[PDB]
């Protein structure tokens, strides 16, 4: 229930964003923890309900189980499969207000910081276009570290 004392509620925003620098697994599933601004990102060869559940499994290992997750109305998020996986985990789910305007501005911003940092780290290593496959995992983890941890 409580958000840990008066602290922010454990609510996540999750989305998928396409990043060809990461092909063939160019579908990046990104979660932003709304209380701490922490971000979890994983790569996927296809945008599907199952890819979203593999991504939430990893985000759950990294940040803990949330009380609720916010997403858009994508089929990979409203499928019977995905609802059931979130029901199995005890996580509430919302797609927001029908005509929400857009409510998930934090995940959108996360999407943009990530593509920019990926581009900057990749160009730093000489990769001006698609990152060679064997170099992608450590570069993506490097971009996730860069936006999460500030030695400060």
């Amino acid at each position: 229930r409580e958000p840990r004392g008066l602290g922010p509620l454990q609510i996540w925003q999750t989305d998928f964003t396409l990043e060809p620098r990461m092909a063939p697994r160019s579908w990046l599933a990104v979660t932003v923890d709304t209380a701490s601004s922490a971000i979890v990102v994983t790569q996927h060869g296809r945008v599907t309900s199952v890819a979203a559940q593999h991504h939430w499994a990893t985000a759950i290992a990294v940040l803990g189980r949330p009380k609720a997750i916010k997403t858009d109305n994508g089929s990979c998020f409203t499928s019977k499969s995905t609802r059931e996986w979130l029901a199995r985990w005890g996580i509430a789910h919302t797609t927001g207000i029908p005509g929400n305007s857009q409510g998930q501005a934090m995940v959108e911003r996360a999407n943009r910081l990530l593509k920019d940092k990926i581009r900057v780290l990749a160009e730093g290593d000489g990769f001006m276009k698609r990152i060679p496959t064997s170099k992608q995992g450590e570069l993506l983890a490097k971009a996730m570290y860069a936006l999460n941890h500030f030695e400060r």
Copy 2:
């Protein structure tokens, strides 16, 4: 748990705003239901923990019990009394991120629409300064109706 299907989470934002047109009970306690934008406002002679609980009792009769309520760090919201009253009701409570910037922008906007509508309805009835005490309850309920219900 679930927000009713994929609908918005039952989360409220509550605050107090001072309105001398309503003296002596010039302290308006306002709650905005974040999923529907509905607003509940009650008047109070003083800003205290108890006034906030009387206001939530009324908001609960009008909108139902919420899963969580967001407020600032006012003493009337972090007192042992208020925490206990919310714990008695099973409602989670958050004051947000310490240095949240300000997270409760919806209640702030609600505060402004309300003072403006109160001023407009009062000037419409010839009351250019404090509203006579005996006319306040129906004018405040009138401003709450005006911002909640659109015959559309």
